[PDB]
Design a protein around this ligand. Structure first.
Ligand SMILES: Nc1ncnc2c1ncn2[C@@H]1O[C@H](COP(=O)(O)OP(=O)(O)OP(=O)(O)O)[C@@H](O)[C@H]1O
Ligand SMILES: Nc1ncnc2c1ncn2[C@@H]1O[C@H](COP(=O)(O)OP(=O)(O)O)[C@@H](O)[C@H]1O
Ligand SMILES: Nc1ncnc2c1ncn2[C@@H]1O[C@H](COP(=O)(O)OP(=O)(O)O)[C@@H](O)[C@H]1O
Ligand SMILES: [Mg+2]
Ligand SMILES: [Mg+2]
Lengths: 464, 48, 49, 468, 468
């Protein structure tokens, strides 16, 4: 009942099985490379049924050293990853193997990575807000519970600290867990993230799944589904809120395109796979709220040629509920998190969802910040004194507002002894309403740096 | 004052032109990729 | 086409129907995917003729 | 002798015939679909001889419900349509079946829709102007009586409204026969044209053939041939001046592209059929006026994605005497008809035909508009204020000229309620000569918008305040 | 033991041989065309072993009249061309036949045109300037004696005129041997070059090998190899300095791409063959100077559609010590030679080789021209009057510099009627040092157009009403 390798073309392997033992599509088959230098066990994923008992599969590992005719064993099920609380605090690959401890979790319950989204009737019909406790996010760009948040930011902008902060807040405030999905992860960066999470003591609350850059396109394609399956177990079997990090989703799309090319499929517009939308939908629709529990996702998105109409970002943004842009300009000012309040956006900043008072306060903050940005050029070149008196008043108010959007994060406690703060949404709304009215314009600017609500503001004001 | 107003208008018009030209350039870039792939795949199919 | 047939059954019985297609861009993309997976030569923007 | 279906690939059917009974190319074969709702008699047109006594044919009706192995019978002749005076006042499909009165025309003489174009010795160039009353067409793109006129344009720019306008202006007071060919266009547009022609009493002179959008590509690529067959009968047998309207010929080309993809032919550039130019040449060369026999053909040509470089309109351009290119840029400014004066052309816009005064005025208008187009780049950033005095004067003149090329059309009354206007060619020449000279530079721009001759300009300027 | 033609399609011919008689790759085979009008003997180069004793070959002559199953003879060796001092002063085709004296050279030593390049250990960088007398080339793109020089450009920018100019300036007073390779270029140009070399008395020192653009792709593929084989014989055997001229080397790549798809190779990007870089690398690496044996090669590289990103010129760029890139913009501005001073480059343009003064002056010229290129759009829109005073000064200096880089060439007289001129390197450096300092800012820019040295500048300025 075992097959045999017939054709080998890079990561594409054709396998012939006996007449009545052809594996199902997406089944995981095992083959052996016995050459000493490259000895390994190849995991092939059945991609096509070619007919005459032939199947075409994508090798999850390089096929160098593979011989024609070697036995191929059908496992009877698709790629399955370990699930349960045991996966927390450990690093896995797209196939479920533990990288930091080989053999770990081999006895856990194993879930196939190909699963359907929640039944249409089980979906929550009403959008909900995910109160993170961060003033900038809660006020300006509220995160959708069970939604999708794009993350934009170069190097040295605090993105890693932001991810650690979100891990902390989901673990502490929501009593949830986190699954990090490094798609196309650089091995150096994966190791750095592992060590950083271990140092910050949040590794215990996180499950890391790495599909590395130096792996064939199949694993880079399937790692996102693996991490999503772990998160789905946490949501559905453990009844926990889960925060899923995908980095980078564009690399998942590009791995899908590479796989489609390898299988001989004719490319679609701009060379992407014909089923680009179908693959993205299959991945993203599994990230939702259901039965009171939810998986919220924050995904790093790469925009080719900075062209937002490009098919990859265009398809990705059909599922995104919020956008958080991290700017080096904000970071240089010392404002943490370095979220650009004008570039960032949320689709639920609508009175019908967050309430009329919230929307009014947020719009006032945005207007003040936009006017300050406009006057920035005159300030820089002609000098501040060149401005009118009303312009100076608005500059002062906007400076205070923009410094108040900074917060003392939980992840920042590992750098400064001071712990983090969680500002309830109502407190943030009323505080920024007061600030926009100019009721704190007389206070020193530094009093608005890295604090929580109004009580912290008063405490730091007395300290100055 | 008129020069300031006119230069602000010219800068706004230049920004709008830059936006439109960037959109057109991205459309052309995508179309060029698609047409190149079309020719390559047509050759491959003919030699199939 | 399923929605259009359901509407047409009423329309040909003297009823008045309003059909919304939200949206036909995604239907065109799906049909392009099917056509490409059938190895039909594509045209403008990789769409079938 | 009867064949059998062997392969069904959409509207393309492969049929195997007994040895020595393979139908000739373009022959009409008949098959049966028996499934209840879709039951019908398929008419197939032999397109290729595949070898081994197999023929590839294009179905004129959808093949839904067709089964492999069903009997196919060869009629021995290609598709034929009724011809004669009786087709006038009636609506037909691509196969010649009457729609407003089924069974009508079955006893008429039937002409095959496939035939050769007139011999080269019989062709004679046509240079007679066809005055329309539209200022832009009359001045810059004069139409040719017995010539070939095309209206190019993107989606929703006014091709069909302009076709209706020319039907109103030319076909209404026409002593000859009219043939309209709807090709891959809206069915409700065909119904509207039918009703409107009935209301104007023009239907009794007109034969309508419809191959509208909701048809298989074979029908959409053969309906034009059927309508052209009726027009050719009127031209060659009755000695009638004939008006031929086609909307839209690009749909014929697009249907040909679909058929070619189905037939398994290697695609050409932009996925079009390799035989694009050949098919277009055959069809267009059949649409012509011979010595002493007049066909005035007006074709609407769709331009995909507003791309005038697309192979279909690009290949269509060479077959025309007058070309009116509708521009989305002009359309966005509210100018109707949205004609691009610089892009449009006419073969008879030369001094030897239209006279020295008309030609000079047209050339001056074109020069002013071209200079304005050149200055557009500077104007977009800095406006007209940085231009030289000559350039400022020219820009004001050009804006007024471009507004005055617009007109309140007869067919536009439905959209605006404003009755259209007719402008005699002499008045058009005089008005545009005055405008290029600079005799209306004081009037406001809007006074030149959607009006007729100089009297209308004076009235509108007086209404707006300016004196004239 | 002879083969037979099996399949014919354009220039590619399939030939079947008996067991154990399959010719080796690149072997030359002979076939007969017996049709009276086209009677000839086809030379076919074996390109592929297809299996089953079949071989795919490229015909060196047109295959019109070739019949399936005709006998094919194997010569047992690749195409070979005559070598020796006897080839000097004669015109040959890609196959080694003497065009101007048929039968000449048949008794000479014959070398196969397929050859491995020199061993890496035999290679030696060349860093000796080759003064030409052309201001732009001598200043910004100094050529290397014994190095590889190319002239890049689109169609009709002056590549051939500059090639003839460099033949006039370098080959006329050259001690050694010259080899000219006409590769897929105009037969009229070949005849003109032949006559010009005969009149200049340079022909006796030159070997001409012509395969013209009317030839089949195989001849255009192999003519460069033939000429390079003659040059290699002169370099390695006779041990004398060799001047090698190729025009146009891009035709080799183009012919390769023409036959690639018929050879069964899946096309690469931009319609080129997948083996573009490898074939170009082989051919170019054969064109080189070894230790103690100098070949100064000058190649005209056609840039398709003026697109310098095209894979052919992009791949060719890596093979040159010096590149003079001709620009369509410069050409259309009337500047000759139409050299793009910002895009061209030379490996010996560093202070160590050319000296501090030359390098500094060249860098200053490049900087000024780059700044002017940056300011051109602002000048076009807002005018020069809105630039800072220093920028106005730089713009005037840059216009004068760009005009002065133009020069009346010896080979350009036929196009302008003005006799050519030559400028020594020291004079060029001094003149451009003066220009970059604004010492000629008072002279009109027209005084700097198409002249030689500073004396010509003074004379032209005086003729224009100004004193230098
Ligand atoms: N002369 C006009 N005056 C006013 N409105 C007009 C005029 N011409 C066109 N329009 C408006 O533009 C719409 C489109 O016109 P029309 O149907 O003639 O365009 P088209 O080029 O044939 O379009 P399509 O590509 O959809 O077939 C008309 O329905 C009407 O709304
Ligand atoms: N809230 C904060 N408090 C203190 N330091 C911070 C804070 N946010 C970011 N940083 C510093 O900025 C750097 C950002 O690096 P990292 O967290 O890897 O994000 P990125 O990948 O954007 O550089 C970190 O080394 C960290 O020390
Ligand atoms: N130095 C020059 N002076 C005047 N005209 C020139 C000069 N160089 C080239 N031209 C013009 O440009 C044309 C193209 O030159 P040529 O080199 O023959 O074509 P290509 O650049 O395609 O090889 C010439 O025929 C000539 O008319
Ligand atoms: Mg229309
Ligand atoms: Mg040339």
């Amino acid at each position: 009942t075992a097959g045999r390798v017939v054709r080998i073309t890079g990561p594409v392997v054709d396998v012939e099985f006996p007449r009545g033992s052809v594996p199902e599509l997406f089944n995981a088959l095992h083959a052996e490379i016995t050459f000493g230098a490259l000895a390994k066990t190849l995991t092939l994923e059945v991609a096509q049924h070619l007919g005459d008992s032939l199947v075409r599969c994508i090798s999850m590992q390089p096929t160098d050293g593979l011989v024609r005719g070697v036995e191929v064993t059908d496992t009877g099920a698709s790629i399955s990853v370990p699930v349960g609380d045991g996966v927390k605090g450990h690093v896995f690959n797209a196939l479920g193997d533990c990288l930091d401890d080989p053999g770990y979790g081999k006895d856990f319950e194993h879930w196939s990575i190909h699963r359907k989204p929640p039944a249409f009737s089980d979906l929550e019909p009403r959008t909900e807000m995910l109160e993170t406790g961060l003033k900038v996010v809660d006020l300006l760009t509220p995160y959708v519970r069970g939604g999708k948040i794009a993350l934009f930011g170069g190097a040295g902008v605090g993105k890693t600290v932001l991810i650690q902060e979100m891990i902390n807040r989901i673990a502490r405030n929501f009593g949830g867990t986190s699954v990090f999905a490094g798609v196309g992860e650089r091995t150096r960066e994966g190791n750095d993230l592992w060590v950083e999470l271990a140092d910050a003591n949040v590794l215990k609350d996180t499950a890391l799944v790495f599909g590395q850059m130096d792996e064939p396109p199949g694993t880079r394609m399937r790692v996102a589904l693996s991490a999503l399956t772990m998160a789905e177990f946490f949501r559905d079997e453990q009844g926990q809120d889960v925060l899923l990090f995908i980095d980078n989703i564009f690399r998942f799309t590009q791995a899908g395109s590479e796989v489609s090319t390898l299988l001989g499929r004719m490319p679609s517009a701009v060379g992407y796979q014909p089923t680009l939308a179908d693959e993205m939908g299959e991945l993203q629709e599994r990230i939702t709220s259901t039965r009171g529990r939810s998986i919220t996702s924050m995904q790093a998105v790469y925009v080719p040629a900075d062209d937002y109409t490009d098919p990859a970002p265009a398809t990705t943004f059909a599922h995104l509920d919020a956008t958080t842009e991290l700017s080096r300009a904000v970071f240089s000012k010392g404002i943490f998190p370095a979220v650009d309040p004008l570039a960032s956006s949320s689709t639920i900043l609508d009175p019908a969802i967050v309430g009329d008072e919230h929307y009014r306060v947020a719009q006032e903050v945005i207007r003040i910040l936009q006017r300050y940005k406009d006057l920035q050029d005159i300030i820089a070149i002609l000098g501040i004194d060149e401005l009118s008196e009303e312009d100076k008043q608005l500059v002062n108010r906007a400076r205070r507002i923009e410094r108040f959007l900074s917060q003392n994060m939980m992840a920042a406690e590992q750098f400064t002894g001071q712990p983090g703060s969680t500002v309830p949404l109502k407190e943030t709304i009323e505080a920024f309403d007061k600030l926009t009215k100019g009721e704190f314009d007389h206070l020193p600017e530094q009093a608005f740096f890295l604090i929580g609500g109004l009580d912290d503001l008063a405490k730091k004001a007395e300290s100055l | 004052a008129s020069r300031r107003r006119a230069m602000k208008s010219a800068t706004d018009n230049a920004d709008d032109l830059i936006k439109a030209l960037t959109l057109a350039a991205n459309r052309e870039r995508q179309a060029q990729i698609t047409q190149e792939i079309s020719e390559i795949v047509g050759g491959a199919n003919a030699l199939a | 086409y399923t929605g259009s047939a359901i509407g047409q059954h009423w329309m040909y019985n003297g009823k008045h129907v309003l059909i919304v297609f939200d949206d036909l861009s995604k239907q065109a993309d799906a049909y392009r995917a099917i056509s490409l997976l059938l190895r039909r030569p594509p045209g403008r923007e990789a769409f079938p003729g």
